[PDB]
Every structure is written in structure tokens, then in C-alpha cells.
Amino acid sequence: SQLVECVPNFSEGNNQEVIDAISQAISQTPGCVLLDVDAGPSTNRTVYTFVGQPECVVEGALSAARTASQLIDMRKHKGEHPRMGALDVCPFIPVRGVSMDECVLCAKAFGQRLAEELNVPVYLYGEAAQMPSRQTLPAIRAGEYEALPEKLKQAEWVPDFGPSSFVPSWGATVTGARKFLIAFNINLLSTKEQAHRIALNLREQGRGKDQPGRLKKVQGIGWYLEEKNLAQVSTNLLDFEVTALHTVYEEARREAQELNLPVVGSQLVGLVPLKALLDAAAFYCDKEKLFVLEEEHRIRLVVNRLGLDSLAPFDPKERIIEYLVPDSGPEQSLLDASLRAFVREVGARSAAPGGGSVAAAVAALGAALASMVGQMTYGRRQFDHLDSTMRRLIPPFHAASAQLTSLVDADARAFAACLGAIKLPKNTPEERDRRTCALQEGLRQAVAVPLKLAETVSQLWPALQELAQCGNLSCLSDLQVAAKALETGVFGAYFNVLINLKDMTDDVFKEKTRHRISSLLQEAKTQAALVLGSLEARKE
Amino acid sequence: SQLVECVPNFSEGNNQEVIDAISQAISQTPGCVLLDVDAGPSTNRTVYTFVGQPECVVEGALSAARTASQLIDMRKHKGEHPRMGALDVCPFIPVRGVSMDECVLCAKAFGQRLAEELNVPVYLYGEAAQMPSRQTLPAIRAGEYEALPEKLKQAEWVPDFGPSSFVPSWGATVTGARKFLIAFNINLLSTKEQAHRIALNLREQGRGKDQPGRLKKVQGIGWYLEEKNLAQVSTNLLDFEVTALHTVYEEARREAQELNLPVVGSQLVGLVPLKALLDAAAFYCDKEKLFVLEEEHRIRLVVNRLGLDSLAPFDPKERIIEYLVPDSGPEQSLLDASLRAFVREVGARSAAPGGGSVAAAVAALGAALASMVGQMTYGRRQFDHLDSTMRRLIPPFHAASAQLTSLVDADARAFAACLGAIKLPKNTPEERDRRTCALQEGLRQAVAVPLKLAETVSQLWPALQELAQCGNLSCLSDLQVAAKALETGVFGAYFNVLINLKDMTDDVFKEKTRHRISSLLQEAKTQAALVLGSLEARKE
Amino acid sequence: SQLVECVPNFSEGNNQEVIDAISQAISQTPGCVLLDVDAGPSTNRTVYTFVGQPECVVEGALSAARTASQLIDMRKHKGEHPRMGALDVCPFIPVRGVSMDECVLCAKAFGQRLAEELNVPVYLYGEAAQMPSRQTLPAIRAGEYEALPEKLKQAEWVPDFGPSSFVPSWGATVTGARKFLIAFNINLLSTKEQAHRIALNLREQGRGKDQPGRLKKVQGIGWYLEEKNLAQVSTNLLDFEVTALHTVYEEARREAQELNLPVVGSQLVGLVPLKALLDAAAFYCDKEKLFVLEEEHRIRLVVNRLGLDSLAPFDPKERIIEYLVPDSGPEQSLLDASLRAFVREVGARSAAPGGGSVAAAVAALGAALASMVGQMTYGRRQFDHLDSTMRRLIPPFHAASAQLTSLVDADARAFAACLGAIKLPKNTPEERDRRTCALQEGLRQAVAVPLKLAETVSQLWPALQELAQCGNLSCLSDLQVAAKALETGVFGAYFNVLINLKDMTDDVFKEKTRHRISSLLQEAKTQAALVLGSLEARKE
């Protein structure tokens, strides 16, 4: 969790010893993970891609520059790509959790610590650069390599970081932060000229100046795969939030049905963020009017809808960032060791798993049961008259189910942080009144999870209630347990909040939480009942 | 589960091709597992050991005889051990679950099907043989190989199975069933003469006839390890239930402290049944007045107390039968897939895990919590005044905990058998009224598990109650959840019984179970309360 | 050319030595090519697939039976698939050129020569069997293996070939001929119950008896891929000519949009005939209103439209029969050796390539030019007002072009057959008057090709004429050459017909052909003119 992508643009030099050496120092930096090293001989550069935590990535960022520092002379460099330094652009993008404003500050970090530890001209670009002339990267590339022999000495071209000095084997470097960018191609069975037409009509810059295309923040052109004999509308989604991965496709689609040319799927080039193609998914269900519950299957759909496997197969387990580098943290979850392990664990001399945890798991067992009857009352003809209802309510349970299963973690994290506080020196005014202060912020979390666990289970009630009305019938049992399990879930949640609020100071927060919690318990108590009622009175 | 050991005594011609060939045909028999093949060159025989289900082992038993049939000529056999056939004794012993009487019937099976499929003289011995002259194996071995040239033709020596015929390359064979036998040696730092004295005094036959030794059903002698310069009281426990593994040791111990000779531990030779050394364990706690909760640790004790690792280390994971071949069954347990797996499973379109199962797990989470507070109130000085009580009640919870964890299985088994019935032809009188009949016996089990799940949780109540009185206090929360969890456990249990009793015919059984169940639910309802009461009124 | 598929159903004893041995004897038969050997352990059979000429395949068919004859004992065979013999069904299907009626006669051949060379009961089935009870294969499989112990001795079950005898290691065999069958699955993101609903609605047998499904000659069911968590409408196209590969897909498509379930592509299982998916292609252009000229590209479309690469990629170069085994013949074509080779070849002391051949090539150069200007006037905006016309005429040229390129072969074949006749003994009445007779049938062909070459070029005239009207203009030159080239093409064609008709006897055929040819030459002469006229008068 807290993922930032970082794509250093390395001026290849062209020769293993340089590449794999940079590509190690970056991969022997703790806290980031090396995701791909694209090298291109005729372009004579190597793009490296790696993700990780805010400060961790910056290490790898500059851990990689100090290894290329003593490995590339730009004097003997000349690639067929408008390079500039030995590290041209080195941008820092969000993936999950981290917002622009952070990525802008990572750029501030790398930029400083770099020009310092080397002595080189560096200007920050994009969502970084303050001077409103530098956000465009190609503008800074002021005619590449041979520029600094005049340009790092102009009141105009003053670097945002780093002296004004010129180094023989270096050529300036540019940090920054942009939005995540996706490479998308659209397969036309047409001709390069036509394909390029279509593209001019989609892309935002449009045919020249005045008269943009249709999609905003989509840039691209017409292209032709040589070996496949296949034309391409090759594009860059500059922001998958503004213009989506499907609204490109679905649009080029129209574009082409206006000129009677078949579109034969697409390809994503490089790595993609989960959301990009997960919104896409939701789009085709919203509009095709469907019900695709399990996430994997939503990826399966949003492939096939865009024919993403047309030029090669699309291994999502290897193409998606959030899957390439999952968000674990330190030490493994109990979530991952066998049921037997979990049970015969809480009951260890474990102060560790327990109470607040079995609360969560009993509750997640709870939801999942309701989820399952939902599905047990689904598909199979006969229940048809309820498909509309089953579709409405199977989800909240299923999604809440997993969410509570995840509170098992939350709980363990909370505790360990509470423990970290407790184990904290003491005594002298500077760290007694500050040790105390963090312990309170400890409990804070400790409290907040059970509280969530309640809040969350407390929403399922009405849908549980309705599911209990119809909803197979041969799962009567399963619903009764379900009702009862979610109930004790909230009981657990309740207790666990109280016992913590005990060591809480901040009566407002307290008194308020105290009361919120109990109502929820109360609601649980009553709600659980009628469910059980309904069921009983159902017994027909 | 249902383990039978089977130790064919093979007249090893002495030569790989014979051994490893038998030892495969036995190991390529489905339903048994090959545990060890002991071969002795100067004895010129090979003892094979393998376990498994009643009928499964018999296959391997006779699957191994038909491969040695066409691989050993007794004409060129002559070992320094009183052999007789190519397969001397082939006995069948219980390990767990299967009783003597069954092992006596396996002997009946192998004996028949063998002399039939070969044409050879076979007499059943031991707990088998009916003629009260044949229970002793050495009596039948009527002077080994050269005997049948006169003895398989005597109204006296008539074989219990098989013609009376003589085969050149075979020499009769003897099936049977005995009790499980352990090889036990006792290490004396003495002399072979002395060691053998000690032994005559323990062993049941004693010094000659009249005047037996002390231990019943222990036979053995004085012996001397050459390379270690170490004497040995070498014994055979003929029945670890009558005279125990420790009562031998602890006795030789006295025996030697009567003659001022040190005893320096012991060794088990071959394989041992879990109970043998698990009772032993319980002995040293009973008498040493201790509290050793976890099973492994009990093995660790009953090692060290008998110095079982003195001649080599004792790998219990590899010496104990019940560990060598665990009692799984068909397909794996859910008990073994991650907590996430279990949750995100019951809530699958699974008719399969669910209801009755989450009942069990919520209940096992329940017990384990109470167990944990017990231990959380144990050890650490301060709680001293409660050590006596903690020791008294931590167990029942802990042992019940695991027992309910195991009902997860039970449940899944029940269901699958119920399903097996349902999926059963139908229609013609022979199999409608008999399909029906098994389905009822189906539900029977389906009912019996939740019912157990209640019964079992219903015993913990009073100890829970008392643990709730004292019992740390900083686990207040943990006990409250615990109380609540066991409660809903019984709720689940309750419902699940009812819904099955619905399709039950047999109103007596019904009406009775109906009522038993509800009382227990009731008891759960009230009992759970005061626990919660006590705890609340404890809040000091 | 002349392709027949042959799928022997072998009762796989299960063990390499059996499989790969059959699979060689079949692949060491000259005139057939081994296309795939599917083996299934739990089914315990191996389906072999191979293609080739009518009589050639039959060799392999029976060349494979005589090797399995002495390699499989049905006595130790027992698979989980309703087998019968060691070679269950051995059917013979058309692929290209060969008609049913031939495939029915191949079945007549294998059936006879087999039961003869072995002595076994064989009945022909399907489009073969005369008795209207045997066309259904499962009916003959009269309860598999244990049947002949009573059934090969019933006035009823009299074999259509082979005695009535029973062999221990064989179990009867069934030849026949059916239509080509495709395995097609439709990927539903639904549930197995639903998927199977959809399927009952498509398949011809429908929900039970009375009330068939929608598609005729499509049989299939509901199915579920375990590892992918993905349901499937699994079908068999029993005749891709009656119900097409797309009309299945496009129908399941509606079927599912009636129940709001997404369909996520499909998979073809095994091998497919080119036409099946080539008609499909033409369908999506007919209805999507497009222009997809080049064949490969048409496969690319009809992939993507059915998402045929969704479960794995679809390598048409390796999935399509007509591509797996192309239709070459004896010795290579000149079509395949470099332009230099061809030129510096006709002009060898070659009686061989020449005249009639350079006729064909000059003509194919002709068409291809006109084709190219068509495309040179296509795509690129500006020529928009002509897209409709360009689409109408680019093809006939392009398709005729390749067709004439293929007359290069024709010509060479003709000649070689003419030569084969000439080189034919002579002299005695039996073979002078019969040698003569074949030589005439020689010239016949020799004539027919140039004649085709004329006829074919003679159709392009009016489209050439119209293409000459508009049609770029910067290719003026290219059209002029084109006109001129097609002209001399017909000249060549003309001469070559005459010179052969010289040795022709059959004045009717002659006089008629003489005249037809000349008119065409004439037409060529005049037509070529105005084309050239138009072009000249175009010069603006």
C-alpha cells in the first residue's frame, strides 16, 4: 500500500555492463521493486520502471544515478532519440494511495539530493516545475546534448536545482511528477493513412491547431505493424480518469464505423494500473446490463470487450501493477495460514491474535454465509423472479465479507503499534509526555477497527432482512447462523471498543464513540432478531 | 483413521532384485503405505512393515506374496534364522480404531485368498488359530524348512488353510493377529552378566519356570552393544496396555539401584504407537506433579524421562506410526487452507462449507479464546495464587477447542455422505426403499455432528463461568467475545439439528433430540449471560 | 489437393509403446500426413488424426490397425469411455475436393481389406451403413466390450464386413463417413446451470423431445472450466454449411443478452476447415459493411469477432487444416523460385516452362497492376467519392491475378501429362489405340488451361475499362501497361490453344474452341484499345 511508480529515462550507452549494473543498484535498494527495464538499441536509451514507497523509491532513483554516474560518458553517446543527459527525464507517478502532492514532493527530494551528490544541472518538470514554461518536457530538452555549452549559463535557463556547471560525461537531468500514462493501440484492419485519419479525430490536438479531436487528454497517431500487415491507431491516455481506456476504444470504434473499416481489438503496451481497466470493466456491465461478481472475471470481461489479447495474450497476473507488487507490509498475515493455524493460534499464549480478531472473522463468516445463500438462490431457473433482487444484494455481503476478512489485519496492525508505543522509553519530560501522546494515538487505531467492524456489519442488516424474506429456503439454517454470526460480530466489536476507550483521555471522542458503539450493538441485537423471526415464520 | 499394521516376514533370498521387487508390489497396492523394510544378511530374511485400512492391507499382504512366489526358491535358501516358508509369519496388528476381532478377520481373509491363489499350506496363528496349540508361533515352526517332507501329511499337523501339498520353492506360510509389540532396550552401564540378571528379574518367564519375574507380558534378556562397550537389558513389551513403556524402564531402574549399577537411558527399536509413549508421558506428570499442555511437549518429556535419545536421536516425526501415516481420508480439509480461503469459501456458491461449519468454527474460536485467557493468567508471578485453578481449566478449553475445530471436517463428511445418498438411483422397489433407507442414515450423521458440537460446548460452561470470576482481567474483552462466541456456536448447532430432523422419520429419536437440543440452546442462552454478568460486575 | 481427414479412434491400452508405435506406422505410410494424436488417460483411448489422398489415407488407416493388432489385448483394457474394440470408430471425412460419395467408398475399402487381413467383426456406420439402424454410432456400441460374447452371433447384429468370430484381444471395429465436425465452446461469464440452459436452447434436440432448440445440426451442452472459473456453452457443429460457426456464436450471443449474461468469446477445440471460419469472415463483412481484401486479414477479423483467442492464442498457421497440409503435388512450382529463376528458366533449353506459361504470368502481371492502381486510388482521403467504386473492382483483379498466377502450374501439369502420354509404349492394338486415346485427353488439358487463361482475363475487361475512367491518374502509365499486358496475355492464350488443337481430333470440340478462342482474342484486341483510348483522352 502507498505505491509510487518511478520511470528513470537512462541514456543507454548501449552495453550490458552499463544496463544490468544500473538495473541492480536500483534493485538492491531496499523498499522498491524493479518492474521492467526496456532497452532500445537504435533509440540508444534504456527506460527503467520500478515502484515502492515515497522515500524508498527516491533511494533507488538516486541509487541508480550514482551508478550510471561512474558508467556513462555522454561524449561517446549518440542515440536516435532526442536525449540530453545520461539520465534524461526521471518522473515520479502515483499508483495507489499516494496523491499528486506527494509525488510533487518526491520530485523535490530526488532533485535536491541528486544535483548535490553529483554536481550537475537539474530542473524539475511537469506537475512539479514552478516556472510555467517547464511543465512541457520537450521544451526543456533545448535541442538535447549540445545545449549546456551555452544554455546552463543563461538567466533564462537557470536550473531549478544544481549549480550551472558543465560535466563532460553528463548532460543535465530532469525530475518531476505527472499523471500515470498508458500506451494504448487500436487495431484497425485498415490502411496507415486511414488509421492516422481516425487518430487525428480522436486525439486532443486534432488536425493541426484550431479544431481539436474528440477525446480530451488522449494523444496519439496512425501507425502500422510491419510483420502483421496491420494498421494501428496508436495512442497515449494521458489521464485514465478523464478519458477512459474504453472511451478511447469505444470511440475509435465509432470513428471507424463512420468510414466502414473494421477495428480488430487492441493492445496495452507496458504496465497498466488496476483501476484503468477496472473502471472499463464496470462500464461494460453498467451498459451491457450484467452481473459479474468476482474481480478476476471483471478483468476477463474488460479484456474480451477490448480484445486485449489479439497481438499476444494478456496475462493480467503479470501486466497489472497492483498484482505485480501486492500491498502486504511487514511480516505475513494470519489471513494466509490455514484455518487450523488461525484457531490454534488465537488460543496460543498469544496476547496477539484474539478477541478483536475473532470478532472480525466470525463477522466475515457471517457476511459470507448471506452472500452464499444469495448465490444459492441465483442462476438456476425457478428463482428467476428473484434474479433482479439477488443481483442487488449478493454484492454488499460479498464485498463487505472480504472487507471484514481484511479487518483481521487492521486489528493485528493496531495492536502492534499499540505495543510499539508501550515499549517506549519514558521518564524525562521530552519523552514521557510524548510517549504518552503516541500511546493515545495508539488506542485511537486500536478502537477505530472494531468500530469500523461494527459500522460495516451494521449496513448489511436491511439487505440481510430482505434476503431472509425470500432467498432460497433450503439454506434456512445457513441464514440463521449468518444472522447470529453477524450479531456476535458486533458484540465482539462493541466490547473491544469499550475496553480501549478505558485508557482513552478525550471524553468528547469517548462519550461520543461509547454511545455510537452501543446503539449499533443494540441495533445488532434487535435486527438480528427479526431476521431470525422472518426465517422462523418462513418455515412453511 | 482405521489403522492396521502388517509385518510380513519374508525369507529374504538375499539379493536386491528379490527385496525391492516384493517391496514395490506391496507399495504399489492402493490403500496401504510402506513404512520400513528391515533386511538382515546373516539372518537371511527381510521383515517388511506397512500400515493401512483392513481390506487394503490384505491386498498388499497377498500382492506381495504373489511377487515373492515367482522370485524365491526355498531350495537354495539357508539363513541363520529359524525360517520355514518364503513368507514365514505374516501377522496383522491394530494401530488405531480397529479392534482385535477385526485383525482376527483380516487374518481369516489373507489366509484363505492366499493358499487359494497359490496352492500352499497355511495355518493361522496367535489371536487367530482356533486349535489351542498353534497360538505359539515357534511351535508351528516345527523345525523349519525340512518339515513339510513329513509334517504337511499328518492328521495332527493339518493346515488351517491350504491342501496338504508340498512345493519345492515354498515352505508353508503362517498368518495371524497379535497385539502390537515394541522393542525396548535399557542401557546399563554395567556388565552383560549383570544386565542379564536384571532382565531375568523383570521378564515374566523369570529365572526358569516356577518364580516368574516382576513385569507381566514383558519378555527379554541381557545383551551387550559391542561398539559402545555398553550392556543392555533388551526387552519386548508384549502389550503396552498391561505393562507400560515406563513401568519397564522405571522398574529396571529400581532393579539396578538394588545392585548399584547406573541405568543410562534406553532406545526404542523400530516403530512405536503414539499411545505407548503418550501414556508414559501422562505418567510422569501424574507423579512429577506437572502441567504440560501441548502434545509435542509431552513427547519431549517422555523422551528425556526415558533418555530415548542416548544411542542416536529420536525423531518422533519419523519414529511414531500415527505421525508417519496421519489419518486424513479423501480430499483435503478446509482446516488446512488459509483463513481467507475458508471465509471466501463458505460464501462461495458452495452448498458445501457453510452453516453447520461456521457454527463449528465460531465455537472453536470460542473455546480457544477462553483457553488463551487461561494461559494469559498463567505463568507470570502475581497470578501464582491461581496456578492451581489455571492448570485445572486451561485444558478442557484447549482440548475442546481442537475437537470443535475438527468438527469442521465431520460436517463436511456428513454432508458428502448425505449427498451420496440423494444422488442414488431410485425407483424399483429394491432400490427406492433402500435408497431411502440410507438417506435417513445420512441425515442421522448430518444431525449427530451439530448435536456433538452442542453437547461439547455445553460442558465448558461451568469452567468458563469460573474462569470469568478471576482470570486475568486485562482480557475482559477476550472473555466476553469468548462467552458470546460459544453461545452462537450452540445457536448454529441448534438450528442445524432442527432443519435435518425435518426430513427425519423416527419420531422417538426425533422428539428426544429435538428437546435435548433446545435445552442446550437454552442453557447456552442463560449461561452465556451470567458469564457476561460476572465479567461486567467484575469491571473494577 | 484432394484432402480427406481420417480419425481412427484407438482404444489406447495406455502406454507410450502402444501409442507412438501405432502413431508411426500411420506416419510411415506414404501419402498421408499425421496431424495430431490426442490421448486421454482416464478415458483410456487415443484419437489419431491424419489427412491425405483417398487411397493413401486407407493405407495408413489399415497400416495402423495391423500395428495395434499385435500390440493391444482388450482383455486387460478398461477405460472410462464407452469403448468396444481396440479400434472403435474409424471414420473418413472430406476436407477439400473429395465428396461424400467418395468418403463413403473409402469406408467401403478400409472395411473390406481390414476384416479380411485380420479376421474381425466390422460394420460400416454413418453416411455409410446401408441398414437404417446403424447410422447412429452409439447404437452399434451395443454396451461396449462385453457384447460380442453374444451379439456377433445374431441374425440381427450380423456384421456388414467380417465373419461373426470373436477374438480375445480385439472387440470389433466400425468404419464409416460423416460430415466434418467442429468442436466449439462459447465462453459465458455466467454459471454452469445458466450456461446449460442457453445450450439447451441452441442445440437441436432441445429441452427433451418435442420442442427442439434453435440451430439445426448443432448439438451441445453446458460446461464449466474449473481452473478459469468460467462457464461454457460447449457445442459441436455437425455441419458448418447448414449452421455456421458464427450463427452458433451470434446466436448464443442473443440467447445470453436475453438473460443478461456476458459472453466472453470462444474457443475451437482441435482442427478446423478453412471454409468454416472463412464463411464466417465473409459474414461479418456482408453485415458490418466492410472491405477486407487479403485472406489472412479475413482470418484476423473472424478471430476477433468470435474472440477465438480468449483461452489461449489461435495460431491459424497451425490450427487450420488447409494450412497445416497445403496442396502442392509432385515436385515444386516455378511459382516459388525467384523472378530471375523463372526468366532464366523459360529460356533454358527447357521445352518445359515457356509460351503458355509466360502467357499466364504476363497476364497475371497484368491484372495485378490494375489491382494496384485500384488500391492506389483507395484509402487516402480525396479519393473518397470513389471508395464505393474502388471496393467494387479492386477484388476481381486481385482474385483473378492470383488465379492466373496459378495457371503457371496448370500449364506445367498439362505439359507433363502430355509428355507422359507421348512416352507411352505403342504398337500392339491394345496399346496403340489406347496410347493414342490418352494423348488426345492429354492435349485436352493442354488446351483447356490457355483457354481458361483467356476466359478469365476476358472478364476483367469492363472493370478495367471503368477503372480506366477515374482511378488515380498518377498511375496512368501503370494502367496502360496493365491494359497492354492483359492483351498479350490473351494473345499468348490464343496461339497456345490453336497449336494444340492442331493434333486434336474431334472437329466439333475443335471448330467450337477455335472460334471461342478467336472472338476472345478479338475482344482483347478491341477492348484493350479503348482502355488505352480512355487513358490517353484522360491525360488532362
Curated annotation (Swiss-Prot), chains A, B, C:
It is found in: Cytoplasm, Cytosol; Golgi apparatus; Cytoplasm, Cytoskeleton, Microtubule organizing center, Centrosome, Centriole. It comes from the Eukaryota. The active site is at H81, D411. Residues 1-180 are annotated as: Formiminotransferase N-subdomain. Specifically expressed in liver (at protein level). Pathway: Amino-acid degradation; L-histidine degradation into L-glutamate; L-glutamate from N-formimidoyl-L-glutamate (transferase route): step 1/1. One of its GO terms (biological process) is L-histidine catabolic process to glutamate and formamide. Keywords: Cytoplasm, Cytoskeleton, Folate-binding, Golgi apparatus, Histidine metabolism, Lyase, Multifunctional enzyme, Phosphoprotein, Transferase. It catalyses: 5-formimidoyltetrahydrofolate + L-glutamate = N-formimidoyl-L-glutamate + (6S)-5,6,7,8-tetrahydrofolate; 5-formimidoyltetrahydrofolate + 2 H(+) = (6R)-5,10-methenyltetrahydrofolate + NH4(+). Residues 334-540 are annotated as: Cyclodeaminase/cyclohydrolase. The modification Phosphoserine is found at S519. One of its GO terms (cellular component) is endoplasmic reticulum. Folate binds at G162, P163, S164, S165, F166, V167, P168, S169, W170, G171. Residues 326-333 are annotated as: Linker. Pfam families: FTCD, FTCD_C, FTCD_N. Its EC number is 2.1.2.5, 4.3.1.4. Residues 181-325 are annotated as: Formiminotransferase C-subdomain. GO terms for molecular function: folic acid binding; formimidoyltetrahydrofolate cyclodeaminase activity; glutamate formimidoyltransferase activity; intermediate filament binding; microtubule binding. Transmembrane segments: none annotated. The keyword Phosphoprotein applies. The keyword NAD does not apply. PANTHER family: FORMIMIDOYLTRANSFERASE-CYCLODEAMINASE, FORMIMINOTRANSFERASE-CYCLODEAMINASE. In the C-terminal section; belongs to the cyclodeaminase/cyclohydrolase family. In the N-terminal section; belongs to the formiminotransferase family. Homooctamer, including four polyglutamate binding sites. The subunits are arranged as a tetramer of dimers, and form a planar ring-shaped structure. Folate-dependent enzyme, that displays both transferase and deaminase activity. Serves to channel one-carbon units from formiminoglutamate to the folate pool. Binds and promotes bundling of vimentin filaments originating from the Golgi. This is Formimidoyltransferase-cyclodeaminase. It comes from Rattus norvegicus (Rat).
